[PDB]
Ligand binder design. Structure first.
Ligand SMILES: Oc1cnnc(S)n1
Ligand SMILES: Oc1cnnc(S)n1
Length: 158
């Protein structure tokens, strides 16, 4: 069902994350981690303390798709096991819990606009662009359900 998903997304904040390659999204899906540039690290740390859930919606540059979405489970932290990001600065590491590892083509989100980016289609935005609550909620509900994920453990972290 979609009820636990809606519960996780209640009053959440949403951020568009743009990866330059598929390899970095693969690492994030395998290890439950993300790292970003300092400007966005600051925004995400501020958001993590401000909201019951912070959702990252991932899109690989030039792919024409989103590759899934995940919820921050921590603020960024330095040290830890090194992540071999295939780079084209990546300071702290956020731990993330994946909510959906399935893709969504941009053609399916054409009816959603982001008020925080001039009401342009939600696929449009720089890395770190915040997505308004209603737009982000509907975008997440468009993804195919990911039956491999159990949101019970995520709900307990809120
Ligand atoms: O492709 C990637 C991987 N990790 N951080 C960033 S900003 N981009
Ligand atoms: O939580 C973390 C931090 N750093 N590396 C890994 S693999 N996980």
């Amino acid at each position: 069902g979609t009820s636990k998903l809606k519960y996780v997304l209640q009053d959440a904040r949403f951020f568009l994350i743009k990866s330059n390659n598929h390899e970095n999204v693969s690492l994030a899906k395998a290890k439950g981690v993300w790292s970003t540039l300092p400007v966005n690290e600051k925004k995400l740390n501020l958001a993590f303390r401000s909201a019951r859930s912070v959702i990252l919606i991932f899109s690989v540059r030039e792919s024409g798709k989103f590759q899934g979405f995940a919820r921050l489970s921590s603020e960024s932290h330095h040290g830890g096991s090194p992540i071999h990001w295939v780079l084209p600065m990546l300071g702290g590491v956020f731990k993330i819990d994946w909510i959906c590892r399935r893709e969504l083509p941009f053609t399916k989100s054409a009816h959603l606009t982001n008020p925080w980016n001039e009401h342009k289609p939600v696929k449009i935005g720089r890395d770190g662009q915040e997505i308004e609550l209603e737009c982000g909620t509907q975008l997440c509900l468009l993804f195919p359900p990911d039956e491999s994920i159990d949101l019970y453990q995520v709900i307990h972290k809120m």
